[PDB]
Scaffold this active site. Structure first.
Site, PDB file in Angstrom:
ATOM      1  N   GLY A   1      26.769 -19.641  32.984  1.00 14.65           N
ATOM      2  CA  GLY A   1      26.137 -20.654  33.834  1.00 14.65           C
ATOM      3  C   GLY A   1      25.621 -21.877  33.067  1.00 14.65           C
ATOM      4  O   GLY A   1      25.887 -22.036  31.879  1.00 14.65           O
ATOM      5  N   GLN A   2      24.850 -22.734  33.739  1.00 17.33           N
ATOM      6  CA  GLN A   2      24.155 -23.831  33.094  1.00 17.33           C
ATOM      7  C   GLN A   2      23.201 -23.380  32.011  1.00 17.33           C
ATOM      8  O   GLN A   2      22.456 -22.410  32.153  1.00 17.33           O
ATOM      9  CB  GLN A   2      23.386 -24.661  34.113  1.00 17.33           C
ATOM     10  CG  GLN A   2      24.305 -25.665  34.817  1.00 17.33           C
ATOM     11  CD  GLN A   2      23.701 -26.234  36.096  1.00 17.33           C
ATOM     12  OE1 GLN A   2      23.694 -25.554  37.117  1.00 17.33           O
ATOM     13  NE2 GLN A   2      23.173 -27.462  36.128  1.00 17.33           N
ATOM     14  N   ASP A   3      23.253 -24.136  30.920  1.00 18.28           N
ATOM     15  CA  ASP A   3      22.401 -23.936  29.768  1.00 18.28           C
ATOM     16  C   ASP A   3      20.920 -23.804  30.087  1.00 18.28           C
ATOM     17  O   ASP A   3      20.213 -23.042  29.433  1.00 18.28           O
ATOM     18  CB  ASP A   3      22.565 -25.105  28.808  1.00 18.28           C
ATOM     19  CG  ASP A   3      23.917 -25.192  28.105  1.00 18.28           C
ATOM     20  OD1 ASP A   3      24.883 -24.515  28.475  1.00 18.28           O
ATOM     21  OD2 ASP A   3      24.000 -25.977  27.160  1.00 18.28           O
TER      22      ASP A   3
END
Ligand SMILES: Nc1nc2c(ncn2[C@@H]2O[C@H](COP(=O)(O)OP(=O)(O)O)[C@@H](O)[C@H]2O)c(=O)[nH]1
Ligand SMILES: [N+]
Length: 173
Positions: free
Chosen positions: A65-67
């Site tokens: 996913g997003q950092d």
């Protein structure tokens, strides 16, 4: 049921089962008849499934996913004794991202002693990477600090699942 009962028994274990989206996590749980679960959403778009079986607890979520959600992942690390990392062996383009996600997880401070089971999943698909190339591609050959094993599986037909879980239960501490 009788198989899960023989493998897990009354053993106490805290397990994470992770992998990229589409690796086969939901299918693995359905095949073992672990049909019910509890969903937690610690932030929008980050879904965690928790399954209890007797004195066993699984937490499950997609990596990749997003950092910005990575800090939230470590809320699930304390006391985790086994990591199951599920890989789609037919998706050759995301194997390097799966490698980087794995090493990010096991390099956390709180994950220094979890043993690693890899499900090298979707062995039935055209030109899927074999267990031995997955060992090299996921950088496992260079991990000398802990115990790990790659189990070929076909989650849709149930092949390799009970064998993989027998490795995990026989090797956890
Ligand atoms: N052919 C094949 N497809 C599989 C296998 N395991 C999972 N799939 C398929 O891959 C897709 C993603 O599986 P899913 O369990 O939803 O992955 P998740 O996103 O990690 O939960 C579904 O279409 C599954 O049926 C397998 O071993 N063989
Ligand atoms: N999933």
């Amino acid at each position: 049921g009788k198989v899960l009962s023989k493998i897990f028994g009354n053993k106490e274990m805290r397990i994470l089962m992770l992998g990229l989206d589409a690796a086969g996590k939901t299918t693995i749980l359905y095949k073992l008849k672990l049909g019910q679960s509890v969903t937690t959403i610690p932030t929008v778009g980050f879904n965690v499934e928790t399954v209890t079986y007797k004195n066993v607890k699984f937490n499950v979520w997609d990596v990749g996913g997003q950092d910005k959600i990575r800090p939230l992942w470590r809320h699930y690390y304390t006391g985790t004794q086994g990591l199951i990392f599920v890989v789609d062996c037919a998706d050759r383009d995301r194997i390097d991202e799966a490698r980087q996600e794995l090493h990010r997880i096991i390099n956390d401070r709180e994950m220094r002693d979890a043993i690693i089971l890899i499900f090298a999943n979707k062995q039935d698909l055209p030109d899927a990477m074999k267990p031995h190339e997955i060992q090299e591609k996921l950088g496992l050959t260079r991990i000398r600090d802990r115990n790990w094993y790659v189990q070929p599986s076909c989650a849709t037909s149930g092949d390799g699942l009970y064998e993989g879980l027998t490795w995990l239960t026989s090797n956890y501490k």
